[PDB]
Amino acid sequence: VNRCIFASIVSFDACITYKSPCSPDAYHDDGWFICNNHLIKRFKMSKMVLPIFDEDDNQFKMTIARHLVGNKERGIKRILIPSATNYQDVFNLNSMMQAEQLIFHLIYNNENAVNTICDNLKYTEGFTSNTQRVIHSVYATTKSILDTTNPNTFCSRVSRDELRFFDVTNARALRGGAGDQLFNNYSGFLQNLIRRAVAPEYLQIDTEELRFRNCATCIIDETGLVASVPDGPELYNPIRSSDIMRSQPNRLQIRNVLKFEGDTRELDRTLSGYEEYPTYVPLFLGYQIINSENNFLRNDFIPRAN
Amino acid sequence: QMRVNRCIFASIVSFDACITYKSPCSPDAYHDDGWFICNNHLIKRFKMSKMVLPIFDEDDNQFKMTIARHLVGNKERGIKRILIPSATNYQDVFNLNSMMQAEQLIFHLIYNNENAVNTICDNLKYTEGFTSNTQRVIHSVYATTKSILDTTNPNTFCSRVSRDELRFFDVTNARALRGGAGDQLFNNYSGFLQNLIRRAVAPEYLQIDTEELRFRNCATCIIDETGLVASVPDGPELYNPIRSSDIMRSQPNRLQIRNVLKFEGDTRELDRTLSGYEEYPTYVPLFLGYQIINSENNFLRNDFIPRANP
Amino acid sequence: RVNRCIFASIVSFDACITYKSPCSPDAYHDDGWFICNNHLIKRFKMSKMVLPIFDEDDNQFKMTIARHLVGNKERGIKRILIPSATNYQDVFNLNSMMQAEQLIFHLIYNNENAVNTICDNLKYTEGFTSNTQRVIHSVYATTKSILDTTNPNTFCSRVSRDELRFFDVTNARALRGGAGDQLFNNYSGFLQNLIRRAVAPEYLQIDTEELRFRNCATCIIDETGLVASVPDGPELYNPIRSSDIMRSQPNRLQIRNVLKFEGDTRELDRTLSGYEEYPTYVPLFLGYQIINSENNFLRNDFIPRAN
Amino acid sequence: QMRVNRCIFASIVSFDACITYKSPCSPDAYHDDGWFICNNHLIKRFKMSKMVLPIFDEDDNQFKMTIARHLVGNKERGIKRILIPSATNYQDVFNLNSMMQAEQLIFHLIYNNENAVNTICDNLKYTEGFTSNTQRVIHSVYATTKSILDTTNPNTFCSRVSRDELRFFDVTNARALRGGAGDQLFNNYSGFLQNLIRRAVAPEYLQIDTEELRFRNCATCIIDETGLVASVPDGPELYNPIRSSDIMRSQPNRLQIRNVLKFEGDTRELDRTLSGYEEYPTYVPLFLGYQIINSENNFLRNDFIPRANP
């Protein structure tokens, strides 16, 4: 079963049918409820797994995502997951079909906009005995996923052993900060997506710290989950092509690429049979505590509530 | 060829890309007569049927004239008697809300209501699947309707007008080349509606070369403010049963209440007694007004021309 | 064919007493009744029936109705057929209704507090997260889905509006309601649909003409709820159609006084058996239903009706 | 398909019922390229040629826009420099009362001159053979011209209009989304002529989302009260050597005195010395104004839509 939230994007008109392009990872029961293709298209992130090894033989993999924000980009083009008070500006929902707009409105709990879409679609002819049950299928699937990830849904089993503080100052004191308050403000599905994409900088398991990176690559500010380093210039993150070129093919866009000139093949062969260190930018931020007694190694998503 | 659907309502389609709809149109829709409407739609919307009034010359040389019979029961009163509503009350007489938007657009064009058609424009432009293919179909419907209207509008550019014929719907001074209040009301109608009224409502009198042929001695309809209405100018309304109608299929999910009249006696033997006799039909034709054919004229023409008002 | 009765789920929350609720076959007929005849009888003291309205030539159409199962000798909370949202926990003995039935009942009356209390109470059990979490979630999901089906305010919930139904027939001819209708509006969408299904209108104005079916209501809508008492005089004789109805708990001991007739009625039996029978019963007649000139009153698929 | 003639002047046909006429529209008339005028008719009437301006980027992608070179000699002065006359001076620039009928009717419609076209109808109606061919041909010409104009008039019912493009001809405040006197005059123009100016006159600046591409450093045309004119906003006019042979011969009988220019001296050896190098054309393109492409746009769209300003 497709678990990508954006799997329900269809055309409210009956004739044209649109099976949204979803990567094969959509059907996996991983913590994610979004596919890699859609995560790239909308939240401009790529899914990856961070494997943590012990000393002798045991490796457990956590999830992580790498953002796709160029260093040159600035402003509203750096936010990966916008906040509910600015998302309608970062996302150009107007040019996003109608089903995608409905899903986005539901993700951010904008029932008013959803009802406006409802009214607009009720006015048109061929809605009652046609578009109805189609908008209903979209809404039902989206709400099902959102309540699956919402810990407050009725009788919704919620994990509570593990804690996640996106502010590392007082994390060892068992307490978050302003970023953590903003995180709590988010919708359950968005909170889960952030907890998946953004790996914790520190990992306190059984009182043992396992600091992974020495500096956070992202920040949770008011604008949202920004792909900005809190020190000096932004990280060089080259993105080549063929990820979102599905964008309207008639939309003429300019792009300032940065090419290297010169023969690199001799240098390449000089040092070729070496393990290559990847140059992506992972999403590292915050602190995660496993709390000794727990069930961290459970192969089934359960909502995590701080 | 002359076998194009000339019924104005032939363009009715679905503004969505599904639910393909072929508007039920009677065969007469393809005939090049001046009706510009099919019998099926004439019955369904304007509740009239397409008859023909043959005027016989004494020697042999008969000629025909279009005439319609209305389908208004004598029991019905109010806005249920209006056959062709005026441009003001039509939105009330016709339940435009309860019909396909294509029919609504055609109707709004028939009454020169630009605001309503533009509102339909905007409502459709608020649709996701609008620019894909619905734009082309709605534009086609508008183009066909406008073309029909220009065909019937005598004020359209290079619109040939046969002014040899004068029709007055108030026969008081019609003999004095003059109309009345009903005629002024009739002038306000759109060209298509004017032609439809002329086709449907035969004149009581016909003046040809000073010869006055009086067909009926009393009008069966009236052009009042509400529009062209099926009601006698005095006394109770004419008994008019119709039985079969468009209510068949139509709206099978809508439950409607009708009180009907029926006879409860054996009539087969009475029928057999009066079996092989000429039958006088008990319909109600639309008779009203006066019509003059000037000594010099082209009244016996085949191609329709938008006859202009007095 | 999918079970439509709202009480269809009712599954033990312990995964030990596994049993299937005794829904009657009519449970699988989507006829606007989202409850089966057996459950309607057991819980709401009503039996399903169809009221056929004939014209004078051929075309007859059917209309749902219900007969209540309240004896004339009953008084107080025993006469209430459908309790209001503020007294149901008193009329219904929800304690002796397992917990799935209690959950369904709490949802029917929008008593989310009691629903959450049931959930919190059941979270303690050591067998919770294994399977009872999912069983409770399934029951809740089915119940909420049915309620949305019958609730016209749900998102994109197509709602019929060419049909008006009042229960205080004083200004119904004025297209206006009354205190009974104000109480009716307070009900949950499912319960409003159930009342409209069970309580036939004594008047049926089909766009010009009043079809008066009964000349007095056999039920009322008061604060206590939908009640089987007559608006005037002693209650209607209703001999419970005998033991036909059911029995629930063999262990529970209860005394019932039953009116007995005496005499050899067999001779009169055939003498009148040579004739057509008029059924006594007691249908639910109350209020005024108007069908406008334009409508889809003969629409097969059920759609919620909103006043 | 490509068998419908999109040129507006294609409908030109003699109103008389005897003498035939075949408009010499160029093959380019059959392409749906946004131009609704063919290259030869553009040359004959508006004194412009049809060129394509290709804009490349550093990579292996490119896109082409339309542009036109005017055919106004440097020595021309007065109303001879006007390429597209305004609605007021057009009857003074064009010699309408010389190009028989039909073409005159199209010209009157292009400038929304209802009175003049009605007068044309009035004059034509008195002809002996009016109800014969003449009325048919005149009606066909009017219908074709009206359809062409509606295709471009953004204010037509259900007429889709693009609004991701913003075109100005005033530049001084184009960076502030605001036009000026030239833009105000441009708005007064007919929709077809607005589209024709947009096609012919390439923008001096091209601003896509945020990057500004400057094509020319000085406009070559102007939009003044007399219309779109081929005068520079500078000193002596650009030297434009008219190719006399290319320009049609029009009227063989009419005797016109033309003071042509002539270069003297042998130049074949110079050509041989400079044969092989890419030649930079000496045409004079139409550059003026400022064009903005919204970040969300459908610029690379095949089907033409009227580009009404926001």
Ligand SMILES: [Zn+2]
């Ligand atoms: Zn996806």
Ligand SMILES: [Zn+2]
């Ligand atoms: Zn028809």
Ligand SMILES: [Zn+2]
């Ligand atoms: Zn049941």
Ligand SMILES: [Zn+2]
């Ligand atoms: Zn041409």
